[PDB]
Amino acid sequence: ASDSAFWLEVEGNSMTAPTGSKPSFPDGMLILVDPEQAVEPGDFCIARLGGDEFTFKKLIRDSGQVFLQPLNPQYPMIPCNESCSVVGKVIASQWPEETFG
Amino acid sequence: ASDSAFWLEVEGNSMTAPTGSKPSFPDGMLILVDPEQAVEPGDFCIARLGGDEFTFKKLIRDSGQVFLQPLNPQYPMIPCNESCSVVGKVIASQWPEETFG
Amino acid sequence: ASDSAFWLEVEGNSMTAPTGSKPSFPDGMLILVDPEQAVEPGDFCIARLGGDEFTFKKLIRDSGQVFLQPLNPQYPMIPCNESCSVVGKVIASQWPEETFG
Amino acid sequence: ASDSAFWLEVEGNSMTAPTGSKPSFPDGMLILVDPEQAVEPGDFCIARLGGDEFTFKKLIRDSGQVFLQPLNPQYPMIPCNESCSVVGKVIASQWPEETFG
Amino acid sequence: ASDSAFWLEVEGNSMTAPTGSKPSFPDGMLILVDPEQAVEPGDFCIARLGGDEFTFKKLIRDSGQVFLQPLNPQYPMIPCNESCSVVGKVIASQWPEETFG
Amino acid sequence: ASDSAFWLEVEGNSMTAPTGSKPSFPDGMLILVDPEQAVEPGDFCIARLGGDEFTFKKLIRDSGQVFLQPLNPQYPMIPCNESCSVVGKVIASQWPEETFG
Amino acid sequence: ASDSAFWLEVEGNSMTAPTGSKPSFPDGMLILVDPEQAVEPGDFCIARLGGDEFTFKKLIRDSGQVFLQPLNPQYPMIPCNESCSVVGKVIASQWPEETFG
Amino acid sequence: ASDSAFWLEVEGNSMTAPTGSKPSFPDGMLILVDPEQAVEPGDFCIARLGGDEFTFKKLIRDSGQVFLQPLNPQYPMIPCNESCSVVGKVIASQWPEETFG
């Protein structure tokens, strides 16, 4: 984990996989982003889209096109082109300790 | 966090909550069981059962009786009695690092 | 595979995993049910309910109880006991050849 | 199947059909690819695209134009012209025997 | 088709199957409901729910339970128990003739 | 309808519309083509490209030019000119009766 | 349009219908919300969900269950229960004048 | 907004931009054309084409040439010379009241 790496809190159900599926990062979890580790296809990541919303998706590649895919199928998959910048690789995820009291 | 504390890999959907509610411990996650800590009502814990098979659940109390309750509505509740014995309180949970490649 | 093993065509969506998750046996696939192989937990199988109902689920164990689980979340889980006899272990599955012209 | 046919393992969601539609080739399945058999419109194939990257899709024809179409609605469709080259016809598909342990 | 049969205009995406799966009854189509024909598992129907409101879905049976299942994945399946009653079997569908003006 | 009208089973997803759009003619349905009725813009029809294979689209006029339009946005629009010959207007569509058990 | 009625700017693509569908409200358009007009199934409303955040969607109901549905089939259809509160009916939508030079 | 200006109902996808890009005038919208105003390059206008057939497009200037550019990349570009005359400027667009209920 580089010095640059920072923590973020999963906010949304976009990355919450269907029951029985894995991995899954339910809204509430923490994810460690590390701007210094490249993001390869199949890796999870944070990416800044148009305007300023960062997103947490699985970066995939199909037919030469790169998409940011959600673990929740009920959500949209999106092309990652011009206004799509990968900020860093998600290298870890754990529930915050409060979660256990 | 005690020294008798150990890691276990969640294997099942019993602790997988309906999308939206939290927390949620999906099959494949890592939980840290600490025997040297008590399981107060509402805490998450491991419990050795008859044939000595662990069970991941939430300890709840209802009239001098103690129950092991799954976060997955589909999974039935279970009364903790003769062969039932808490093995420790779950204090942490994270995805194995292999998860992030 | 015993000389008693037999093929069956999956008919239904009880074993159809959510896009992204495996395995999955969509309606249309074939499955080899071997009556002579024991069904350990975590194994896919063909069980009979009542006496004439053929069911295709994943046999599991939660909190000391055995359940026939569907790979399709929307479908209810079911406890396997008295009127629930395992018919055989699913040991292979493939699409029927016609599937390809 | 020709002696030049090999097995590939599906990696992705592009060929995963929505519940109800068939066939479907979810990530993790094995597909037999025969480079000696030709791919007629409607067949399932592997094709080499731009940077020579392989892609598993359905070859279709519409309005006298050829397309590589995914079984999964979320994925885009691609015109199979110049930099599109067919590697082989998909002729079999099954889960690896590990699937049933 | 009995003398009691009547047509209903499909209102809603409940029975719209995803692209590539058939059949599909998109919002706008016509369905001939016949109250005098029994609805076997597999058939499409109109059932009246506890609310006392009408619903259009596919009736299925799994592990002994009966459900009214939609063709659109985004919609929930529902057990057809007490407050669930079959109004009639859906036996034909077509676009109104205005569709082609 | 004229005596020149015949039935055609829609084959392909060119005329399948996005969920929540109408009309829509999913692969599987039956469209009634009547060669004797003029195909006005906004009408559905069967056309011939290169004087051979049929294309089932929606004739339209934009900026003085004519195009055969697919109800599926993924499919490209195609200019109807020289090698483009309209075979007849689509006047009715329905699911074959087998569809309903 | 009551006094309470206020204007919001559509932000996002949850209500951008697929090319060739209607209505549709691309990110950028304005929408008049009137808290004083009820919202019947089929209406376009503004709801406030859990996180104290607002959503613009079409209220619908299926099998006696209310859902907030998006015009974009990509996005998810969410059940509107406990934490879901309908704030107002959307009764108008127009682009801002700046739009047109 | 002049006395000569009038409302028109957009009919077509010619002016339906790709999701994300704005503006976008989906088939079904109302656009207000003001004959009295001039259509500077970049503005949206109406145009009489030959035998009196309207066209909704954007007025661009490429190579000292005045074309009619569509917002839908799928639709061909058209030059506005002889048999092409502007009919006014699009100064406002909005959805018909009937759209909301």
Side-chain angles (χ1 to χ4, degrees):
Chain A
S2 89
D3 297 45
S4 303
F6 58 103
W7 283 83
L8 283 189
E9 194 193 328
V10 159
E11 265 147 49
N13 309 176
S14 120
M15 291 298 280
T16 305
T19 299
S21 301
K22 71 168 176 171
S24 183
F25 316 84
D27 163 68
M29 295 195 75
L30 273 46
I31 51 181
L32 174 68
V33 185
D34 183 2
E36 294 189 44
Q37 285 184 60
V39 174
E40 321 258 286
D43 282 357
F44 294 99
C45 67
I46 288 294
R48 183 231 49 194
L49 295 185
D52 256 2
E53 77 278 24
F54 296 37
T55 173
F56 171 44
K57 307 280 160 296
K58 176 180 189 188
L59 183 158
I60 68 181
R61 189 178 177 76
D62 190 288
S63 301
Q65 185 68 254
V66 172
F67 303 82
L68 295 189
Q69 183 189 66
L71 291 181
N72 182 344
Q74 287 210 208
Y75 279 60
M77 187 182 304
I78 79 178
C80 182
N81 299 299
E82 175 65 10
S83 50
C84 178
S85 310
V86 170
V87 172
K89 184 181 181 179
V90 173
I91 59 179
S93 185
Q94 36 157 288
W95 286 97
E97 68 179 301
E98 304 59 29
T99 296
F100 307 81
Chain B
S2 108
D3 311 311
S4 297
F6 60 117
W7 285 111
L8 272 178
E9 192 208 304
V10 179
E11 312 195 317
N13 302 153
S14 43
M15 290 311 281
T16 306
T19 297
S21 70
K22 71 179 181 182
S24 184
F25 309 107
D27 171 88
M29 284 203 78
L30 260 36
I31 50 173
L32 187 64
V33 188
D34 186 312
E36 299 166 61
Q37 294 189 54
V39 178
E40 297 299 299
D43 273 349
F44 296 106
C45 65
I46 279 302
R48 182 138 26 207
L49 290 181
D52 282 53
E53 63 188 304
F54 289 162
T55 190
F56 185 8
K57 304 280 180 286
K58 162 185 286 181
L59 191 169
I60 62 175
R61 303 187 124 300
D62 190 351
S63 306
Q65 171 72 288
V66 171
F67 291 98
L68 295 181
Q69 182 188 76
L71 292 186
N72 183 323
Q74 290 181 68
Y75 290 65
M77 208 174 277
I78 161 192
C80 188
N81 292 331
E82 56 188 74
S83 88
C84 176
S85 173
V86 166
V87 179
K89 178 205 191 176
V90 168
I91 59 176
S93 195
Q94 42 177 271
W95 282 92
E97 78 175 309
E98 84 185 8
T99 301
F100 314 90
Chain C
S2 69
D3 303 305
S4 56
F6 57 96
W7 286 89
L8 282 183
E9 183 190 328
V10 155
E11 305 186 296
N13 317 178
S14 68
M15 294 299 273
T16 300
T19 304
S21 58
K22 47 159 171 173
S24 182
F25 316 100
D27 166 66
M29 303 197 61
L30 271 24
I31 52 181
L32 184 45
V33 187
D34 184 315
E36 279 182 57
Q37 294 177 69
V39 182
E40 305 298 302
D43 282 22
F44 296 109
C45 66
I46 292 298
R48 197 152 217 171
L49 304 180
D52 278 70
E53 289 286 291
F54 238 15
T55 191
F56 174 50
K57 313 272 173 301
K58 183 187 184 200
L59 182 137
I60 65 171
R61 296 260 311 181
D62 183 61
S63 298
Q65 180 58 171
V66 176
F67 298 86
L68 288 182
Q69 164 179 50
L71 282 184
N72 195 320
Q74 293 221 52
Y75 286 62
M77 204 155 280
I78 124 177
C80 195
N81 299 305
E82 288 57 279
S83 51
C84 183
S85 183
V86 164
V87 177
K89 171 181 188 178
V90 172
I91 64 189
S93 173
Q94 30 136 313
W95 288 97
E97 73 171 306
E98 311 84 72
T99 301
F100 312 90
Chain D
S2 88
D3 289 341
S4 272
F6 54 106
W7 285 97
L8 282 194
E9 192 214 64
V10 190
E11 294 160 297
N13 298 138
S14 62
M15 292 300 281
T16 305
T19 329
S21 39
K22 75 166 165 171
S24 195
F25 310 110
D27 168 77
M29 289 206 85
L30 267 20
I31 53 173
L32 186 52
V33 184
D34 198 331
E36 266 172 57
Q37 302 194 39
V39 172
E40 298 295 317
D43 292 317
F44 292 116
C45 70
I46 288 301
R48 175 187 310 263
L49 307 175
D52 284 271
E53 60 184 298
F54 282 12
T55 191
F56 177 24
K57 306 276 184 282
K58 181 185 196 185
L59 175 112
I60 64 160
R61 197 188 180 89
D62 189 86
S63 296
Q65 168 52 203
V66 166
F67 297 94
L68 290 171
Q69 178 198 79
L71 295 184
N72 178 309
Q74 291 219 63
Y75 290 67
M77 192 177 255
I78 175 191
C80 189
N81 306 312
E82 199 44 288
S83 41
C84 184
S85 186
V86 168
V87 174
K89 198 207 184 191
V90 182
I91 63 179
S93 197
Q94 37 156 292
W95 283 100
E97 72 178 305
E98 301 68 68
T99 300
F100 315 78
Chain E
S2 92
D3 270 324
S4 299
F6 60 100
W7 287 86
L8 286 171
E9 194 206 304
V10 168
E11 289 163 300
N13 311 142
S14 158
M15 296 304 271
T16 299
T19 326
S21 39
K22 75 178 179 171
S24 175
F25 309 109
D27 164 69
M29 290 198 76
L30 264 38
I31 50 172
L32 174 66
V33 185
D34 182 350
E36 290 184 65
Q37 300 191 54
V39 169
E40 313 277 308
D43 297 321
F44 293 101
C45 66
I46 287 291
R48 85 147 75 217
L49 298 183
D52 216 350
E53 70 189 84
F54 278 7
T55 190
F56 176 30
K57 310 275 186 291
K58 179 178 184 198
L59 175 148
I60 65 178
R61 197 287 217 320
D62 183 272
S63 303
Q65 169 63 201
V66 168
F67 308 80
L68 297 188
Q69 182 180 84
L71 289 195
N72 175 359
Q74 304 220 68
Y75 290 63
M77 191 172 325
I78 87 157
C80 186
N81 298 308
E82 203 51 295
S83 305
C84 182
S85 199
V86 171
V87 169
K89 177 176 170 176
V90 165
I91 71 180
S93 190
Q94 39 153 292
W95 288 87
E97 75 182 306
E98 296 61 65
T99 286
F100 321 91
Chain F
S2 89
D3 307 300
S4 290
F6 56 103
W7 287 98
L8 277 176
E9 182 199 307
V10 157
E11 308 185 306
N13 308 137
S14 49
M15 296 302 283
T16 294
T19 302
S21 304
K22 66 181 179 176
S24 181
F25 310 90
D27 166 85
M29 304 197 74
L30 271 37
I31 53 171
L32 181 66
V33 204
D34 189 335
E36 284 177 56
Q37 299 172 58
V39 173
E40 308 285 309
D43 282 35
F44 292 114
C45 70
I46 292 300
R48 223 153 195 161
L49 305 167
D52 36 40
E53 90 261 290
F54 288 164
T55 182
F56 171 35
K57 311 284 171 291
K58 174 186 177 191
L59 195 165
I60 61 162
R61 289 261 301 177
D62 179 71
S63 300
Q65 187 59 187
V66 164
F67 304 77
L68 287 198
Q69 183 187 75
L71 277 195
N72 188 318
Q74 284 215 61
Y75 289 59
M77 196 158 271
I78 144 183
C80 183
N81 300 309
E82 199 51 280
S83 45
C84 183
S85 178
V86 177
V87 179
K89 172 180 178 177
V90 174
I91 61 171
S93 187
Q94 59 182 253
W95 282 97
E97 80 175 308
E98 301 66 62
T99 304
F100 314 92
Chain G
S2 73
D3 263 348
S4 316
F6 57 95
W7 283 89
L8 282 183
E9 184 199 301
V10 159
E11 320 190 309
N13 301 154
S14 53
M15 295 297 266
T16 296
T19 288
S21 299
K22 67 171 184 162
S24 180
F25 314 87
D27 159 58
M29 294 191 73
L30 285 19
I31 50 186
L32 185 60
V33 192
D34 175 308
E36 294 183 54
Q37 290 178 51
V39 163
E40 304 294 316
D43 287 327
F44 295 105
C45 55
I46 283 298
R48 181 230 59 220
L49 299 179
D52 186 57
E53 53 96 320
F54 298 14
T55 183
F56 164 35
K57 312 243 166 306
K58 169 184 179 185
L59 195 166
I60 71 177
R61 170 194 210 78
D62 185 275
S63 307
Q65 173 49 273
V66 173
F67 298 85
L68 291 202
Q69 181 197 84
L71 295 181
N72 185 329
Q74 295 300 237
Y75 294 44
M77 176 180 302
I78 96 173
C80 179
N81 303 311
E82 209 73 298
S83 54
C84 177
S85 299
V86 176
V87 171
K89 176 178 197 177
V90 182
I91 60 175
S93 183
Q94 46 167 283
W95 289 90
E97 74 177 12
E98 300 61 57
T99 302
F100 319 82
Chain H
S2 74
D3 292 65
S4 306
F6 63 113
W7 284 109
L8 281 185
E9 188 210 302
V10 183
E11 290 175 285
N13 308 159
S14 41
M15 294 304 270
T16 299
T19 302
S21 55
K22 67 182 175 183
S24 176
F25 308 99
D27 163 59
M29 288 205 72
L30 273 21
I31 58 169
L32 190 66
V33 197
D34 182 306
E36 295 176 53
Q37 291 184 54
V39 177
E40 299 310 299
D43 297 18
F44 298 108
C45 62
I46 286 300
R48 188 51 121 308
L49 279 182
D52 282 35
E53 69 179 313
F54 275 157
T55 221
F56 183 9
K57 301 285 185 294
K58 182 179 184 180
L59 190 58
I60 64 176
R61 276 275 301 180
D62 176 44
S63 305
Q65 178 81 172
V66 166
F67 310 74
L68 297 180
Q69 193 178 72
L71 290 180
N72 185 328
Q74 292 182 64
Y75 285 46
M77 202 165 290
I78 158 188
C80 192
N81 310 311
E82 186 59 295
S83 49
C84 176
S85 64
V86 171
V87 185
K89 171 184 180 177
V90 179
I91 58 168
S93 183
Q94 35 159 283
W95 284 85
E97 183 169 2
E98 297 75 44
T99 316
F100 310 100

